[PDB]
Each structure stands twice: as C-alpha cells, then as structure tokens.
Amino acid sequence: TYVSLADLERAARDVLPGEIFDFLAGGSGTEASLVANRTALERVFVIPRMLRDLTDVTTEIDIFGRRAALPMAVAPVAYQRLFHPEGELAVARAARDAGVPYTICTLSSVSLEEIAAVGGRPWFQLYWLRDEKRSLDLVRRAEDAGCEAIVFTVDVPWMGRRLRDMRNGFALPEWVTAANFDFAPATWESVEAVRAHTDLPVVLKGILAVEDARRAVDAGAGGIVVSNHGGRQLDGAVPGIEMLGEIVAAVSGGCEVLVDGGIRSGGDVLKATALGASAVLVGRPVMWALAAAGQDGVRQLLELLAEEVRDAMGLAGCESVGAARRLNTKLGVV
Amino acid sequence: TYVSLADLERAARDVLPGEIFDFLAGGSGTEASLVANRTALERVFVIPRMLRDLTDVTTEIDIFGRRAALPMAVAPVAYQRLFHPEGELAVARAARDAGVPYTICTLSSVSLEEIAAVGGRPWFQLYWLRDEKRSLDLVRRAEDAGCEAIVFTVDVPWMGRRLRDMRNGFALPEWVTAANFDFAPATWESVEAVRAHTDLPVVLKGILAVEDARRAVDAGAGGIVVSNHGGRQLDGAVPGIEMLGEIVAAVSGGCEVLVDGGIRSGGDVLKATALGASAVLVGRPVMWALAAAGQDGVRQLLELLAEEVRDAMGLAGCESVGAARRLNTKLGVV
Amino acid sequence: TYVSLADLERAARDVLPGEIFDFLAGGSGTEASLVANRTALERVFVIPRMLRDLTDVTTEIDIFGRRAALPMAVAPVAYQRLFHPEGELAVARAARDAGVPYTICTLSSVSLEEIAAVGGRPWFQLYWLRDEKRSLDLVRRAEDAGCEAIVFTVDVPWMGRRLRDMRNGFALPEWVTAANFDFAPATWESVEAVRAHTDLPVVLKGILAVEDARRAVDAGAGGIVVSNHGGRQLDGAVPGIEMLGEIVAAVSGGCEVLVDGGIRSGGDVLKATALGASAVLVGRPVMWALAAAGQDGVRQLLELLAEEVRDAMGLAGCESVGAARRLNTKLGVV
Amino acid sequence: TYVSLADLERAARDVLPGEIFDFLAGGSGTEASLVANRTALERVFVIPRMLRDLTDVTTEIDIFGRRAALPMAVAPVAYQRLFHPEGELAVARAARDAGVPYTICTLSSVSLEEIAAVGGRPWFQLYWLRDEKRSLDLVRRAEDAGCEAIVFTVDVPWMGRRLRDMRNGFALPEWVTAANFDFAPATWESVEAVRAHTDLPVVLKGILAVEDARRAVDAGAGGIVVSNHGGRQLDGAVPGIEMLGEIVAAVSGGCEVLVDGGIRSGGDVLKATALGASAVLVGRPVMWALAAAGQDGVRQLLELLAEEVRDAMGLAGCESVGAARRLNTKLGVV
Ligand SMILES: CC(=O)[N@+]12O[C@]13C(=O)NC(=O)N=C3N(C[C@H](O)[C@H](O)[C@H](O)COP(=O)(O)O)c1cc(C)c(C)cc12
Numbered sequence A, B, C, D: 001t002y003v004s005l006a007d008l009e010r011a012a013r014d015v016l017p018g019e020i021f022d023f024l025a026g027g028s029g030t031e032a033s034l035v036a037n038r039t040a041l042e043r044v045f046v047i048p049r050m051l052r053d054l055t056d057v058t059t060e061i062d063i064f065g066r067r068a069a070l071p072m073a074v075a076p077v078a079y080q081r082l083f084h085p086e087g088e089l090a091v092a093r094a095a096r097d098a099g100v101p102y103t104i105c106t107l108s109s110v111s112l113e114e115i116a117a118v119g120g121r122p123w124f125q126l127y128w129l130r131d132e133k134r135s136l137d138l139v140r141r142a143e144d145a146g147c148e149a150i151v152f153t154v155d156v157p158w159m160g161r162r163l164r165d166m167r168n169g170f171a172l173p174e175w176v177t178a179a180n181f182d183f184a185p186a187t188w189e190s191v192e193a194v195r196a197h198t199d200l201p202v203v204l205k206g207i208l209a210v211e212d213a214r215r216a217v218d219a220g221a222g223g224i225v226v227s228n229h230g231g232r233q234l235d236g237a238v239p240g241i242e243m244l245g246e247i248v249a250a251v252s253g254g255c256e257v258l259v260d261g262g263i264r265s266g267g268d269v270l271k272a273t274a275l276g277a278s279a280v281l282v283g284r285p286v287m288w289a290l291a292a293a294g295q296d297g298v299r300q301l302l303e304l305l306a307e308e309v310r311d312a313m314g315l316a317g318c319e320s321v322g323a324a325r326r327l328n329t330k331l332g333v334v
C-alpha cells in the first residue's frame, strides 16, 4: 500500500542481500554523478498554469509508432533475476499491463524471445559486441521477436568502476546468467551498421553533449536518451537533466529526446517534460518494486507513478503531455 | 508571552493530536514546495534606507476599498474547529480587533454568515463547485452577509496528494463539518461568471505564471495572490515569492498583487513588500496561535506581527508601506 | 597564547554570565543578518599577486588626519564594563598602545573624558538624542576632549528586537551605567546640524544603500561605515560586505569607506580591503578579548590581528594597504 | 589492495603520529582555501563525448622535453622522511617506475643528488634563498645532477600560518634535516636571474592572477603551476582550479599550464584537463601512500591513478589528453 517510491526502496533494502542492493544502488567513483542526478531535479521548479480546461486530462503519448499510457518506459537494467526469481518476466508483464514500454537488456537473465512473448510491444537495448555480425544478430533477433525500437547504449565502451562492487567483491551468483548468449567500444560507424540493418527506430542512449545529439539526428536516430547511465559510467559526468533543455533546442524536433536518472515521482516526470523531454526512463525504482513484491510490486509502482503523473499534470494546468512540454521552469536553491 | 512565531508552533505541537498537527503542517509530495517557500524568503536581503523622517510611521494600507491595519490578511484555512473549539469565530474576532482582514473559507467549520456577523469586514474564499449555480449562490450569500472581496482559489482543480495525511489515514473527525453545506475545476469562464455575478472585487488566489497574472488583469480581477497554496498543491511548484517581482512588473499596477507562503515575521512582510507585494497572507502561524490559546492566542500573534512590521519598516527607513515597496533587495546565500 | 580569534570567544564564554555573553553575541530577529555577515566574508576569495617587492611591507594607513597602525579601528560597543571591570579604559589603553583608533560610545560605561584622557587620539560615536542641543553638547564635549572624528550612528532610529535579551529578560546590572549622562530618530537635517557644529570629520555609520552613500558624500561626510550594526538592527538587512564594492564605486573617492560585521582575522581584513574598504571596524572579538583577560587580552588580540594582516598582505603581494585595495576577488561557494 | 585514494588517507592516519598527520593534512588560517580546493573540483561536471574511436587510448603527454606516462607529476612536498624512513627515495623510485615526473624539493630530507641518482628524469623545486648566489648554486646543482625543469615556487615570500602546527607546537624531529644544506622573497628579477642561469625550463609555481600568468610567459617561463600551495599559504586564496580556464585562455599556448590542489582521482585529472591544464600535480595522496606502505604504497597509488585516468578518458570519448582538453564542462551544485 505504497504512497511514494521511497516506501519501495526500504522494502527492497530489507529483502535483498546487501551486496545485491549495492550492485543496484551504487554508482561509479565517489558517486558524484549518482547524487547529482537527484540534486539536479530538486533544483528545478515548475511554473504551473491555472484555469485551463482539464475535462479530458490524458497522460498518453505516441512514441516510436506506438501509443504509451504514460511518458515513461522501464529503463534497461541488466540481470533482473538478481532481484526476484521471475526477473524480467515479472517486470515485462506489469509494464505490458500498465501500457508502459519495457526495455529488454542485452544482458537480460531471461532470453529476449521469452520476454517479448509476454507481449506489450517491448524495446531492445543493444550493447555492441566484439564482432559487428554478432551485434547485428542480436538486432535481428530482437526485431524478429517483435521489439519495436533498438536502444543502442553508446556510453559504455566498457563498464564504469563501481567501488561498492569492488569493496564487496561482488559477482553474479551462478544461478543468474546472460540468457541471450550460449564487448567492444561502439562508434558512429556501429550506429550506421545498426541503422542499415533494421527499419526499427534506433535510439541512442547515453548522449550528453549537444553536438552528439545533433550528430545522432544527422545519423538517422529516431531518438536519444539523455543520460549518464544512472551515475554508473563516468563519475563526474553531468546529469542528463542539466543538458536536456539545450539538447532539445539543438535537435529542434529532429528526434525524440528522452531523459533518465533520478526520476522518483510523477512530479519529476513533469519536470523532465517541462524541460522538453518526450518521455523518461525509470530504472532503480522498478527494481525496488520487483525485489519488494515481484510482478505485483511493479504493478503497484506503475499505478502510483501513473496517478502522480496525472495529479502533477492537472495541478500544472496541462491536459496533455504536449502542454506539459510548454510549461516553463525556474531554477531554485536546495 | 511569545516573542516570535516559532514559540506558537511548539505550543500548538504540544496541544494538537499528531494527525491534526500534520494535516496543518504538511505539504504535497516530498514537501519540496513547502520548504522552498521558506528558503526563498531566507535568501532575500533588504537594502534599508537611513535618515528618513519617521515621525508618523504607519503600517496601514487601503485595499479592496477598506483600510487595513497591516499589509496582511488571514489566509483561507479550511476547518478551523480542527484546531480549537471556537474555530473560525475565535480567529475572526481577533482579526477584527486587530484591524486585519479575515478570509472565510468555502470549507469553513462555522457558517459564513455566523463568521461575517463577527464584523471586521471579512473576505470570502470560493472553491468552484460541480455546478455554476451552486458556486454563484455561495458568492451571493457571501456578498449578502457583507463580505468585501471574493478570493477565488484557482490552483485547486482538485486537492494535492498529502502523504502525511495518507500515511496517518487522516480524516475529518465527525464533530467537524463543512458548515456552509446542508467540486469542479475552475476555468477562465468560471472567473467571468463570478465577475458578472458580483460587484465585489474578485481576487484570484494561486497565480504563479506571469501570463496568468496578466490575464487575471485582463479578466477584470481586482487582485491576485501569488501563491503555491502553502506547498500543498503541486509539489515542485515555484514559491510565490520567487515569481512576485516579475508578476508585479507585468501587471504594472493593474490589480493588487498579494503573496503568501512562509511569512513568519514582520521582517518577512517587509521582504514581500520590498519585492512589490500589496499585502501578504498568513496561514499556518494563525492556526498555531488558535490551537495554542484560542482567540487570545490569535490576538497575541497579530500584536507580535504588528510590532515586528512597524519595527522592520522603521529600521528600513519607511514611514509607509508604499515606501517599503520602493526598497531594493539583494539575493544572498543560505 | 591565542593563535586565532576563536580561542578568545571560548575564553569569554567560560568567564561571562550567560545573559551577558548573549547580550554580546546576539542579533535581532532570527539572526539572519548576523550569520550573513560571516557567510558573506566566507564566500569571498582573494586573487593574490606574486613576485612583488616586499622589502618594506607596511600595514599603516592615514585616515581622518591621523596615521593608524592597521586599517582597523575598535568598533563602538556600548557598556563595556559589562565584560570586564576596567571596561572602556582597558580597551582604549590597548588600542592606544597598538596604534589602533578606539571609538568611544555615547553609551559608554566610563565617561568620554576619562576615556579620551587615556590618549591614543580616539573617535566618538554619536547617538542622536531627543533634543538637537543635547546631541550637539555631546559632540562639543567629544571634540573638547580631543576626539578626532564623530561616528554618527544612523541605523538606529530605535534599537532592534533582540530575542536573546527578551528570552533572558536581560537588563543592565545596577553597577553599569551610561556614564556620559547625569533618543530620537536621526535625519539628514541632524547630519547637517552636526556637520555645522564641528570641523571634525563626520562619519556616518550604518549606510547600506548606494544612494545613501552618495548622499553622505553630498552631505559633507568625511567617511561612512558600511554596516548592518553587527546583525543587531534590521534582521534581513544585507551585510555591509555585500554592498561595499558597489558603494566604493559610487562614492568614487569622495569619502573614506569603512566596513564592519564579522571581521575575525587578518585575512578578513584583506578581503574587505580588496573589496575597496579604507579600513574595517572590529566589535565582538575585542569584547571577547576584554572579557577573557582585560587590557592584556585586548593587546594580545590586536597583536594577533596585526600579525595576521601583515602575513595576509605579504602572501597576497601587497606592500601597502593601497596595493591591497587593488587586489581582485572571486566569489566562491560555501 | 586500495580501490580509491581515501583508503590510503585512513591507512596513513593509523600509522603516522598525529602531529605529523596534521603537518601533512593542514592548511593556513581557518583552512578555507584547503576546503575550497575540494569544493571547486566537486562543482565541475564533464560533458563526455560518445562513439569516438578508442582503439589506442593513451594517457601519455610530452612535457618540458620528456614523455610522461600520465598528465601528472608528484608535487614538491618537503621533508618526506617525516612520513616513511626511505622518504624521497621511496617516492622517486615509484615515480620513475610509473613514468611520472618527481619534483625534488629544496627542503628535501635526502640530498637532491641522491634523489636524482634514482633516475626517472626528475624536476627540481626552488625556494629563493637570502642570497642570489646560493639560489643559483642550487639551480646549477640540480641541473648538473640531471634535473629537467626548475619549479620555482613563487607563492612563498615566507611560510603561511598553520594553526594545526602552532596548536601542536610541531617541529621537525632531530632525525629529519634539510639535506641540501650543510630564505628571501622572490621577485620578477629573481625569475630573470634563474632564467639566465639555466637553459632548463623554468616553471613558476603558485600563480593565481591572470596578469601574473601573462607576465610569466613574457618572462620566458616554460610553464606555470596554477596553485594556492594546497591551501597552506594565503588562507582565502582562490583555488587554482577556479582560475585555470581564464589563465589558459590568457596565455594562449605560450607556456604549459599545470594545476594542483585537491586532485584525488583520475576523474579529477580529467576535470583539470577539460579546464585546459597540461598536467596536474598531486601532493598529499602520494604522502599518504608513502606513509602507508613506502615505495610499494606509492607504486599502488600511481597504478590506481593511472587506471582511473584511462577509465575516465575513455568513458569521456578521449583517445588522448589533447582530446580531453577539448571536452567541455558545466558547473553544478554541491
Ligand atoms: C550499464 C548498467 O550499469 N545497467 O544495466 C544497464 C544496462 O545494462 N544497459 C543500459 O543501457 N543501462 C543500464 N543501466 C542504466 C539504466 O538504463 C538507466 O540509465 C538508469 O537506471 C536511470 O537512472 P535511475 O532511474 O536508476 O536513477 C543500469 C542501471 C542499473 C540500476 C543497473 C543495476 C544496471 C544498469
């Protein structure tokens, strides 16, 4: 009977082994980027509009050819059986039932075909493999299984240095595997190789520089995710939310611009929208819900977010997510 | 024998049931807007003027056709019998005796006619009802009872999500009722309907966007209250005090511009004035005083505020509230 | 054997009755201006210059016709017998011996003539009295006793609201009196009355507005003290150090521009100088030293400040206080 | 088996006598500049670039005619036998083996000739002596011993006031001596005297003012170190990292521009690079490593830094330190 996302963090902390909670919670380095994701959202204040017609508030959007129930998708988080035995299938089922896109990870602990069979028109997150042809096989598999977008993670030439995991000597338990298997630095040529191999929208995840956003458009990306990988890659990378406004201006409608990092309420969703985001991704909260109560947990989380998004939108005078994008903001202190 | 408003918060905390103190104290969401109301005032510093004639310092203003003793009114706070058995009549009597306008709430726990009978030329706060005609009946009742302004709350299409009240499972005790009765989203058309129905000044409460202030003037409002509803509506809404200067400039004397949220001293009143406010509203402190010592409590609070306003004005070289509006300010840190 | 001013605060706290320590330490209201005096100095960073000739570093200045050993004077602090039985004579003797001007208070607990007899060419702080003629008698007395400047306090139409003193019910012990006696709001006309009555330099203390600084020059002031009275007058008044740069620019050498509030080291002196101050006043630290060890205490404090000023100047590449005024600064965080 | 530099601080704290740990850790005054070195780096966020070719990431630079393995040198820290019995020889050996320049101090506790014999093409830090000829003898000795640059410390006309060392009554133990011996304020003429006496690059250490950087170039310096001496000289001096961008712009490639103060990770190195630094110096961390585990300790520290630099560079899309200099940054909060 949770009333905010923080309820679920506590519940997940109680049930998960410490080293697993740390694998989930932690960031790279001193966790400066992890913390900055939160600080950056806290400093954003919305300027609500009043006395608008709210006789049909809708939180729906159209993205990558599909209607979604909220301007939100479940972020790609690897190895979800770490958190609950049903892992990715529990999350995907809840996401489907909520009308929220679910991003299947290259490092999923259940095969992408089994996750896609859940239904819910899922997305597929790609990590570039040591060989172009194995990469492109994942893409084709995803597409053949009915995934509707390829989320190419471009901020992971290699994994960041996570000191929690080093101090814990954390390693996958033997009962969790990379189920899509029986990694190399991506480049712009890799992007092109993917774009040529699929007619699905290619979404580049982990863009923070304005000219990288621009180049993503030029490269034929259908979207980008403005993201510092939840503070888990470069420690000291700017939060996506701090780059988002500038990026949205630069691409000037040329692709969808998503953001992630630290989204913890419908109000946060509203802030991201007001800064110009098409949609957000949510990572850690979904895994807290999964750890706490499995599929039911994720369903309750998504219902809570949905209600908070609708509440925030209406209180801000927005009948639609488009209207929310036209809200103005003001930076405040603490 | 209180020397600041914080004395009365402690006294109210001691006497009220926890769930009632929480209903009063709390805001929506993570209470970001609640806290920001205070932070925003703390960051404002006044640039006082020296060596001016102070041989008749006056704190009086003329507003909505009436002289008021201070640039201050009691904010509309619902269900005041929650805090003290005499509820609204205790507050209204103290306000009358102090020469301070009292705002009667649509959700008052004593009928608007009984409160108005106290005297003191009160204001009436309107919430828009599911039917235009019931709304307009409240207006007419208020007017027939001698209310001198209609404070139309425009930031409440519905009530915000107050997690204290959810976590407490708070509900009105059966001995507190909405005494004006034996709610729909307001729009600009609702405003017009009200404006056409009364010759009293219509004051729109809960304006934060500059173009909403502008439109309020265009709409024939006699005033606005720049307000985030004490942090109880949209969590992450900008504090009114952060919008006030821009709003005052935009309306360029076309209506009175009031502010509220976090006013806790005569010095705060001075800051709001220096930013351009015609007057402030004060909410929670009046309810602390009511809970602590009933009518006497509210009288002591209003006397303390009056003395602090006069002290701050004089120390800043202002013989009048108009002069205080011409003070300059500087933003500082913490 | 103190190495910083904070050593002496602790020592004074140990020896003084609490209510007296509070009378000394406290400010008005919530102590926002008191704290801001410190915060404002902490945020100032100096840009030192290197490789300059330091073969005769001097901390001396010429001010109001006299050489002073440091760009520093002892601020006017009333009733110094509250802190030590020798009161003002202990402080004045130490100041004389250090070559630092001492400001005699209108509310001194030893008569201005006895303090002036100590020697050291002292200044006299004026509070305007209910009658022009009694005010001007104080001035003439001061002058006849060999005071070299009149420091007219202009930020005290009346005393601020000090909640420590109210909560303590603090009052002068019967053994401390206003020894110059056997108060009205000052105006610009009062200033003129003083200026016409003495050929001593008139220094207006408690100026914070730029146009008040300008007008002080126009009025024939020989100096001003940019000051919020140590946070003891208007609570929420800007710190002097935040106004100083703008004020120095505006007066454009037309009078000496002193600053006070929170000066606690030679480094602070350097910051004030770099912002354009002619000199600083130091209040509370001198009273800590007095309370801790009487005349000897004040001598040790002034020796410590002198050494810290010389050290800071040299490390910043300044052979003279003039050179220090030409240093640049940068605002930092915390 | 350390995973960050903070591991080594704890280890050094455990093993060193308190007064020695304090001599190492402390700064001048209230330690404002010491703390600001850290704060200033924490506020810098990097804008990483994605999808660049990383098939030969190199951390090497060419500086002062030599290839270095990292854009990093060991800062001049006096009396290193205070921390470990092998003192400077332990550090120099580790630095040589890591391919990192080591700066030999004028106040080294082992003679400059013995340190230089370790190999590793070392630099020599000069303090100006009371007599030009003794100064220039040190220079010539350094050069004759195969030092490759003279790091002239120009921010030490005399040593700052370190209150830890005063409160501890700290003094060199009799078993630590200034081994180069059997001090006067430097000026621009001193610089010239040095420049005329050696063909080695002269690097001026402790420049913070832009026009001092400019003048260093004009003076024929081959480099500068933008530095507040680790917060140990002027308390309230701006951090070097806050001046670096402006200084790099002003010198416009006319000399190498190094920075130091608070560098505690490869990410910090990356930030300094992105602000335009040619290289950084690292002081206290190297001494922690020395105290913790002697030569082995310093080797582990330099290996950890090397890995963190390579990791940060790659994650930011930089194949080279030059590319890292072309990264953009954004200031954030806390
Ligand atoms: C590389 C990695 O370390 N992984 O599993 C990815 C991955 O394999 N593929 C990828 O593309 N992203 C990953 N993320 C980042 C995620 O997608 C979001 O960017 C942030 O979670 C949003 O911030 P949040 O909402 O959590 O504050 C992520 C996040 C967490 C919590 C874990 C445990 C693993 C990962």
Ligand SMILES: CC(=O)[N@+]12O[C@]13C(=O)NC(=O)N=C3N(C[C@H](O)[C@H](O)[C@H](O)COP(=O)(O)O)c1cc(C)c(C)cc12
Pocket (backbone or CB within 6 Å): B023, B024, B025, B037, B075, B076, B077, B078, B105, B107, B125, B153, B156, B205, B227, B228, B229, B230, B232, B260, B261, B262, B263, B281, B282, B283, B284, B285
């Ligand atoms: C909706 C609501 O939740 N109510 O009861 C209103 C309401 O019925 N009609 C309305 O117009 N305003 C309401 N307020 C906001 C009030 O008017 C001021 O805006 C802030 O109190 C100023 O900030 P403060 O001085 O307290 O810091 C309010 C305030 C409190 C404390 C309670 C318990 C109830 C309410």
Ligand SMILES: CC(=O)[N@+]12O[C@]13C(=O)NC(=O)N=C3N(C[C@H](O)[C@H](O)[C@H](O)COP(=O)(O)O)c1cc(C)c(C)cc12
Pocket (backbone or CB within 6 Å): C023, C024, C025, C037, C075, C076, C077, C078, C105, C107, C125, C153, C156, C205, C227, C228, C229, C230, C232, C260, C261, C262, C263, C281, C282, C283, C284, C285
């Ligand atoms: C009015 C008053 O309340 N008095 O006694 C004055 C006064 O009678 N005449 C006046 O002109 N100033 C007074 N001050 C302000 C003083 O001169 C400096 O402005 C600040 O002390 C600098 O900040 P500081 O260095 O202390 O941080 C002052 C200061 C203290 C600590 C006490 C106990 C009494 C006073």
Ligand SMILES: CC(=O)[N@+]12O[C@]13C(=O)NC(=O)N=C3N(C[C@H](O)[C@H](O)[C@H](O)COP(=O)(O)O)c1cc(C)c(C)cc12
Pocket (backbone or CB within 6 Å): D023, D024, D025, D037, D075, D076, D077, D078, D105, D107, D125, D153, D156, D205, D227, D228, D229, D230, D232, D260, D261, D262, D263, D281, D282, D283, D284, D285
């Ligand atoms: C004067 C002095 O007090 N000494 O020994 C110098 C010196 O004799 N010659 C010089 O030129 N510099 C010195 N430093 C500053 C050092 O070179 C770096 O500027 C900072 O250490 C970088 O910041 P950090 O990485 O430590 O945060 C320094 C540093 C420490 C920790 C000690 C104990 C002694 C010194």
Ligand SMILES: [Mg+2]
Pocket (backbone or CB within 6 Å): A259, A260, A261, A262, A263, A264, A280, A281, A282, A283
């Ligand atoms: Mg997120």
Ligand SMILES: [Mg+2]
Pocket (backbone or CB within 6 Å): B259, B260, B261, B262, B263, B264, B280, B281, B282, B283
């Ligand atoms: Mg208020």
Ligand SMILES: [Mg+2]
Pocket (backbone or CB within 6 Å): C259, C260, C261, C262, C263, C264, C280, C281, C282, C283
């Ligand atoms: Mg002072």
Ligand SMILES: [Mg+2]
Pocket (backbone or CB within 6 Å): D259, D260, D261, D262, D263, D264, D280, D281, D282, D283
């Ligand atoms: Mg460093």
